[PDB]
Amino acid sequence: TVLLEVPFSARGDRIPDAVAELRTREPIRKVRTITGAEAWLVSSYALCTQVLEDRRFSMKETAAAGAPRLNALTVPPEVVNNMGNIADAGLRKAVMKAITPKAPGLEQFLRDTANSLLDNLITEGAPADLRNDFADPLATALHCKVLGIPQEDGPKLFRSLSIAFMSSADPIPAAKINWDRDIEYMAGILENPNITTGLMGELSRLRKDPAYSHVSDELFATIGVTFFGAGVISTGSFLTTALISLIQRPQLRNLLHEKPELIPAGVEELLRINLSFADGLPRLATADIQVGDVLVRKGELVLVLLEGANFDPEHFPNPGSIELDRPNPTSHLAFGRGQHFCPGSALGRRHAQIGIEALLKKMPGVDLAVPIDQLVWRTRFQRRIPERLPVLW
Ligand code: HEM
Numbered sequence: 001t002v003l004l005e006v007p008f009s010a011r012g013d014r015i016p017d018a019v020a021e022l023r024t025r026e027p028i029r030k031v032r033t034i035t036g037a038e039a040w041l042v043s044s045y046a047l048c049t050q051v052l053e054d055r056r057f058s059m060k061e062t063a064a065a066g067a068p069r070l071n072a073l074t075v076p077p078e079v080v081n082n083m084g085n086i087a088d089a090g091l092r093k094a095v096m097k098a099i100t101p102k103a104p105g106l107e108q109f110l111r112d113t114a115n116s117l118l119d120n121l122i123t124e125g126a127p128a129d130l131r132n133d134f135a136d137p138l139a140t141a142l143h144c145k146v147l148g149i150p151q152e153d154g155p156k157l158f159r160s161l162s163i164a165f166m167s168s169a170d171p172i173p174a175a176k177i178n179w180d181r182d183i184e185y186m187a188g189i190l191e192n193p194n195i196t197t198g199l200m201g202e203l204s205r206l207r208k209d210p211a212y213s214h215v216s217d218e219l220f221a222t223i224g225v226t227f228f229g230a231g232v233i234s235t236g237s238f239l240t241t242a243l244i245s246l247i248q249r250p251q252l253r254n255l256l257h258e259k260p261e262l263i264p265a266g267v268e269e270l271l272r273i274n275l276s277f278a279d280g281l282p283r284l285a286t287a288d289i290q291v292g293d294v295l296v297r298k299g300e301l302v303l304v305l306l307e308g309a310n311f312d313p314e315h316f317p318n319p320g321s322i323e324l325d326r327p328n329p330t331s332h333l334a335f336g337r338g339q340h341f342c343p344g345s346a347l348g349r350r351h352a353q354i355g356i357e358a359l360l361k362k363m364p365g366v367d368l369a370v371p372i373d374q375l376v377w378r379t380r381f382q383r384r385i386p387e388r389l390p391v392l393w
């Protein structure tokens with residue numbers, strides 16, 4: 001037989017039995033990626049945390065020419081170090097302030113947007129597609145608001161994403177076409193005097209402030225493209241798969257409908273059990289480092305399997321169960337850990353909380369309109385998502 005291939009399954013509605021078998025028998029295991037490279041797949045909570053908390057397992061070095069690769073780059077190689085570049089430019093605090101859910105009126109905007117989307121689905125009549133006509137447009141609208149860019153520019157930026165977040169063995173020509181176009185758009189935004197709010201309004205001011213005169217225009221535009229894309233793909237995909245998990249648990253759906261104060265705890269468990277990330281998080285070793293029974297060598301690729309950690313019964317007893325009273329509820333790895341912990345975590349939580357609260361109020365009888373096996377799972381992509389999510393209510 002051949003070396004075990006990753007990823008195991010593109011389905012986001014169930015974890016393969018194989019994950020628990022691997023975690024028990026070989027929590028760091030050699031695998032082959034879609035490029036043909038070998039990698040170490042890490043699947044226990046303890047070892048996933050170790051890798052994420054040791055910067056000698058480097059994100060930036062995954063972009064090096066000649067490295068073993070999980071998948072092809074979809075951005076210029078310097079952009080792999082995007083957060084590091086933002087920090088080196090003195091922009092980290094400002095970027096992170098702009099993308100919290102705390103700006104006045106933001107939560108109300110999200111509730112209003114969710115309720116409008118849902119009212120339109122009710123008017124049109126069942127079946128409704130909760131991914132294309134709810135979760136993704138909600139994500140897109142939220143990120144236009146957060147960035148300060150016109151709502152009407154959202155759809156075109158959004159349509160880059162089905163290519164931009166591919167997990168491909170080979171370079172993708174369309175990813176460069178869309179990247180270059182979206183960078184030109186964000187560069188125009190920075191020159192547009194009407195853009196005075198959100199992340200892009202703040203970057204536009206900092207760009208003209210003397211304390212940032214040597215930061216490149218390229219970096220300013222890149223922040224807009226990267227934060228829009230990462231935020232929209234992550235929140236739309238997470239909310240979509242969380243809605244499936246909720247729909248397939250009518251008792252929990254009814255509990256959260258009846259006691260919406262429990263929605264934050266419910267969303268935190270839906271984060272823990274989420275299968276949205278299609279691949280392990282990649283890192284390149286910059287030293288020889290012992291990880292469990294394996295001495296990982298300098299230059300080797302390590303893949304941190306989030307569902308490995310998050311379904312580890314040694315950390316989360318009865319891991320497949322949504323339990324709203326766990327003693328360690330935010331200790332999951334859904335947002336990563338360590339140097340590269342997601343800067344959008346609070347915004348992603350709020351997007352999903354508000355989306356679920358609105359859906360349960362408007363569509364308390366929401367259910368799948370097709371058998372669950374009829375959902376079409378996107379392949380060779382950095383997220384697991386169903387192409388359509390047909391529901392009735
Ligand atoms: C529920 C929604 C979200 C989830 C589950 C999620 C998850 C993650 C995870 C697991 C990582 C770690 C990557 C790694 O270590 O290799 C990450 C990184 C990142 N996320 Fe999120 N994310 C979400 C929403 C957002 C939003 C809304 C934004 C921006 C508006 C965002 C921006 C980023 C960025 C920029 C990084 C890279 C940070 C770095 O390299 O230090 N994320 N995210």
Ligand SMILES: Fc1ccc(-c2nn(-c3ccccc3)cc2Cn2ccnc2)cc1
Pocket residue numbers: 074075079080082083160161164165178179182225226227228229230382
């Ligand atoms: F810190 C970040 C660094 C890079 C990106 C990124 N953005 N885009 C993109 C966003 C919109 C349209 C086109 C492309 C592609 C990537 C590459 N990527 C994917 C997962 N990790 C890195 C986002 C955050």
